[PDB]
Amino acid sequence: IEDKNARVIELIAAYRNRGHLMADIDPLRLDNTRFRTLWDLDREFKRKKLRDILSVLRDAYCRHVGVEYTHILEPEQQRWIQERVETKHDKPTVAEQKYILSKLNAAEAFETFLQTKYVGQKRFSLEGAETVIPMMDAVIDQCAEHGLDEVVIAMPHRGRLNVLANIVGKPYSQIFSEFEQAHGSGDVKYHLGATGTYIQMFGDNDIEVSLTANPSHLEAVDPVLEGLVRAKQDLLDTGEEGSDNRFSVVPLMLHGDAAFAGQGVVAETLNLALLRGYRTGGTIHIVVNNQIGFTTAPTDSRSSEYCTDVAKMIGAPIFHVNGDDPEACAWVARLAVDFRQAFKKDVVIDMLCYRRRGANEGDDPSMTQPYMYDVIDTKRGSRKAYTEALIGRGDISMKEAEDALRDYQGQLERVFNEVRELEKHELATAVDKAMLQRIGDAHLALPEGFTVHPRVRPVLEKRREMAYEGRIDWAFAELLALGSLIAEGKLVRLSGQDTQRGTFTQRHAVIVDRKTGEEFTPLQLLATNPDGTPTGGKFLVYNSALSEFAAVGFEYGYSVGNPDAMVLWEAQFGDFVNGAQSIIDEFISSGEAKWGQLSDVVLLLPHGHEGQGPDHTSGRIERFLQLWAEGSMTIAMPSTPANYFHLLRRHGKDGIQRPLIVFTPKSMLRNKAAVSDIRDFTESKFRSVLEEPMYTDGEGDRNKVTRLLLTSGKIYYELAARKAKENREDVAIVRIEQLAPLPRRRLAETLDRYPNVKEKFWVQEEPANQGAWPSFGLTLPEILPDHFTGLKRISRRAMSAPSSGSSKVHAVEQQEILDTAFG
Amino acid sequence: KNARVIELIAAYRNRGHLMADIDPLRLDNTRFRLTLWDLDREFKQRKKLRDILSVLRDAYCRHVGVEYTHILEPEQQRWIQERVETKHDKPTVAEQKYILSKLNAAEAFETFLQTKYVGQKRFSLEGAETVIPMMDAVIDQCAEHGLDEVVIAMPHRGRLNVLANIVGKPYSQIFSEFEQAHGSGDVKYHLGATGTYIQMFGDNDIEVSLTANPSHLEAVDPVLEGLVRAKQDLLDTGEEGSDNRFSVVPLMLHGDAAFAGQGVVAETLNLALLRGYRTGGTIHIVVNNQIGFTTAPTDSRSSEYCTDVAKMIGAPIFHVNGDDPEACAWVARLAVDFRQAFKKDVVIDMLCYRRRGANEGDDPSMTQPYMYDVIDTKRGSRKAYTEALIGRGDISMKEAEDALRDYQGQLERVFNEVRELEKHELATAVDKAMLQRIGDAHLALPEGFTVHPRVRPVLEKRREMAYEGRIDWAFAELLALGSLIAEGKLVRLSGQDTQRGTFTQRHAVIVDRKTGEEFTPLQLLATNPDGTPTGGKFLVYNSALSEFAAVGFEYGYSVGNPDAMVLWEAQFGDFVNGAQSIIDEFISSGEAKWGQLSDVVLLLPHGHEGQGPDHTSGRIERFLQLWAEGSMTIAMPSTPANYFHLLRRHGKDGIQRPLIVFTPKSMLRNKAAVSDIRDFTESKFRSVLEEPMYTDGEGDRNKVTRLLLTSGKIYYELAARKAKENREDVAIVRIEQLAPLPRRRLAETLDRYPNVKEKFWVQEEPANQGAWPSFGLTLPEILPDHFTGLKRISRRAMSAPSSGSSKVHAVEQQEILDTAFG
Ligand SMILES: Cc1ncc(C[n+]2csc(CCOP(=O)(O)OP(=O)(O)O)c2C)c(N)n1
Ligand SMILES: Cc1ncc(C[n+]2csc(CCOP(=O)(O)OP(=O)(O)O)c2C)c(N)n1
Ligand SMILES: [Ca+2]
Ligand SMILES: [Ca+2]
Ligand SMILES: [Mg+2]
Ligand SMILES: [Mg+2]
Description:
Chain A: Its cofactor is Mg(2+); thiamine diphosphate. By secondary structure, chain A is an alpha/beta fold.
């Protein structure tokens, strides 16, 4: 009947849409509520019997795999999943089953060794979650089967050393070398990066496997992994910026259930997944879902059914899999890789498991989760269970079962023995005029039929004029630096919020056709020599998403992935970079000292007191200076276009991997005094300390100076204009262009040229507790006591905010600084 | 045939929104691009296919795109389905005229603002004015449900319009001393406000408020939630209340690019149904003008809609055409009804356009030439809706002309009113019985309650400490909070694993070994011995794994209820940098910027113990750098009793100021770090502490030639070394209150050591960290006769808070102790 056939259609849709709500995914079965005509079952429907349709639906959607995919908007993706999930799956070969068991044996023997040999390692234990090892193995093996080049992993602490041994393939001698509290991070080896080669067992392919470094800040590494992968993909000419659509470098990202639901950086990183500036062709996510977060239950950790519900944001398919079924876990891992290869989109695997040990050393987890731990106490391991089931199903003989147990024992013996044996042993930046002229000419070498917006056309003509006649402004000097690096063969990646045009309408790195909307990148012409051959260089410029945390994390990641790239991230205003504070604190400022991991990332932070309020005034110079330690970063605030040009060229050509923090201008972009001569680009270098041009080039007399004003940034021009207005020959203004490391020798040598100075003042726009004064006021009299003893401060008064909220108050305070400096 | 119909119905319900006419600009030209005899056949409840298809097209493919089949609760899917799939009778002309009056009021405000003042184009609501009759419908529907208050959080776009036409603030207050291509134009764009909404066609009124915010888009989102939650707790409504009304409604506005890119959005959505954070569902309005400064949506997000993040918590989503203010008002009322029925978030994606540019003097056709050639052909929302009402025969020409008179009068009124405005232009000690009561409370277990065998000694020890002394840090904290509850104060404590405590020291909540039932010993102190309530309460929760949203929430909670004691605890101080935007933009600076006060406490476990650079520092140097006179109190107590007095002073001083506490980890179990009963019953907070051998023992201060100034747990190590070597020539002085510096108490303490020849600031932290960067510069300036020649003893300056090796940590710690006694 038509009514009966309709009930079947509704039944099929119910299993496809909501079957996952009844699938037997929890190996602990904590929730019992979850589970709570006969003649029609043998009737054929449109041609299969109802019982056979219902058996296929129960096997596919209500067994050990919960499939969520009907939320996906692309019908072809829903169809692809449906077809692969709704078929009579042939059980794996005994060889495949034995191989999964061997990986479970290796994982368990590793955990047993680690928890028996050392005392304080329980909090990092993978016990109850060992099925993640044959699962990761299946991901990597499937990537090798597709002929891909590398799998890059990011993960937290749980099972880290097991992943090093059984996935990366690192030897025990390297893993437990100089191996080391009830809480906190263990050995530094729980944080370091690693590289290895994975060799297929039943295939003839190999693939590179790497693991990126990370802090204890859960999920903070997520955008770093994406950036590192994208840099590697651009190097291999694969993916978005490549010749092929393979995206042959795969991000494999591990997570914990509580961190995946609560950390905002997860959503920000998922949001990058299909962006032209940030896509990596889909990430394979594995959530180690042990249904606990330290002592916190999932009902206090999230407001949704699953810890993975955030991934619905980008229409990713989600697979909830029972961690006690390593075959279903391996099968889902392979399906995930196939989906990622077919659609270049993220796949999330929610592996339901348990945490056998506590949240900290000496923890009795039944104190806060008595019910969960009374169930965990009855649980046998996933290895013993999978071995028991294979004999139960008659898949392996009793002899084969004992050999598997002696493989376990041999694996345990080997790591004890190997660690026992280990314990027994224990450049010029100036360019030629022709280079400047070429970059100028590039702004007018428009494609045939291209229509420039009438307001952009004068910018291009003025850049040709500047290249040939001088008075080069800040925005053009930046493009002269990047353009000349591209001409020399360097990859330049520039990104940030509205960075193609520039927040202050100054950059125009990308220009838009007035009639078609087609994008044109003038600096990209520098990637080709006049002979028509490539330089090897490239200009990659993007408008970022409205993120700071993920975007800064990505760019840091990108510089790690390709140390030969020039990577710049620009804040809309330096004031918004505090949204990426975790990246600044945990990776950029400290990654080198903590993990030996190097980055040459540039942060461009528009900075300056101009009356636009406390969120459009400061990049927090004082915070970056406080983070600095010898050799960790370079911190600068250039006052001239040419000095900024030389700063960027020195950074890209010095052969050193060190982050550069630049406090960049806003109104000073259009200050007509803030322009440079051609000779400043062709016959000079970066100057960490600058004197007034009247003393280095003019008829100024340094011996008339009794008051020395030390400063940095745009306030120089205001100080210099007041000096000229009042003909103050008794006053000299010295700029500190490089704030960190302090240019001690150049500063001492410059000050020695003013012998009649009776008083020295550090002049700054920022409040007394901000800017360079908190560090300079303490460091300058200590590093140079014969020069800075008695150094006094001229600044805004100390404030709890970077500035006043009133532009009227700003103007009064600015004038007060100028009147004090010349009082 | 019947099967094809079932599939057709599901296709409209699930994907009809992909074909709905939601974009007023119709930028995507590919968006729109079994038999006719079956159309007249009745299907199964018995309706013709033509009728089923008309209802489905009207409900899902007109000016409203409905997303709801992702919702796992079947009763919620059914509720939406039933209200959306009905033959909707067109509104009454009076209702249409009311919607027009709100568009009249919205456009007259924008015309005035963009004509009277220069530099206002980047904040313009032009192209998005339909958000005003939409917000009006939200608030009017909340008043119709008899609710108490609507609290709004929004960015700059249409902020003053909302002040005038939603909050009801007069023009004289909005434009008072009203003050440039970029940034924030006026402080009025950031300030909080409060008003009363009076219904037009009803007899209800409702309070309407707007919370303060920085320019950091979406950062205010968790702050709004905390604020509303505190107001709900005060009204005894919602989760911690007698009724399930949740009578205070969060109304949260957003921009399309910020809603998709900011992680704090997901973190705040994640709080929506949590017992410690739920507010009964938030009404979200996304002002989706399909642009983010100069950035197109394809570079801003990886999903079809800017609102796709809201699917995380199964919120229903309504995409509505901003050129249809009737559909916009209808969806707003439906959203309020859903929120009231299910106590869950509702998201309204209002598709509109941004008439002006991203900054003053911007020509947005430079970067979006196609969008702006379409915007240039667009007539305003008010003129379009007026023209539509004329064509549909809903209003006569006289009625349309009277609507234009109403518009013209509203525009004249603002100009005139602003023209007229321009013409005029405590003891913290408790009694022994209080300590004994808090001790006894730990053993006053409910009938049949089974204590975990490892928790029972903690309870018994607490009874012992209360009566015999040697009170440890963890108990001293509960003595402070418990005594405040006994005095009638609401105490809210939360953070990651805060019920048990990260270091298994707190046990604020204990769990029944057999049933899992929670017991809160301090909640017994909310009742007097005679049985009457004190008016106090203990609200303690395990937070989600968030820092940004959790810190934002607690800050907002203290703003919502200034009489509450609100404490947020970091698992380790090292993770608080994930909440840097809240520290920088609200906690440290809200008072100076907006006059907005908070008494929030941040508890940051801190100390060098060899657990690595992410389990060592709460970054004291960063909080000290943020501090300015009167903004915050910053402390690092060394004794349980001093921490007790610090919390009691904070809760009872009648001052709304954040308190930053650097709390211990191993020092929780240090047997020397214990206090006597008399320290709680006959003392007070001590900003400076001397060694007990000089204040209570036989020590001689005149023998001291070397003074060691320090803070925190390193004191005990310095004191133990002094004892071991009998170093009478050395004295150790602790600075318990780091900010504001206790200048007088410090000077008076140091005057008691006349023979001191050298002074050293001793700290565990690297030289560029801890208190030395600020103290090394401030102490010789504020007290030159005491600290000229002050020298530092510390770890060497580092780019990380510590070494990654516990072996390196131990060597460096011993080096500090040997230098201090060298
Ligand atoms: C950003 C951040 N916040 C807090 C912590 C402290 N912390 C360490 S483990 C833990 C609970 C983690 O739960 P989950 O994500 O489910 O992982 P699991 O330990 O269960 O594998 C927390 C809150 C952290 N390391 N990082
Ligand atoms: C956290 C943060 N990052 C960056 C900015 C700078 N910013 C100001 S407006 C803008 C674009 C906003 O787009 P959208 O959210 O769609 O709002 P709209 O201006 O279109 O209403 C940005 C990136 C900011 N204010 N806050
Ligand atoms: Ca370099
Ligand atoms: Ca207070
Ligand atoms: Mg977990
Ligand atoms: Mg927008």
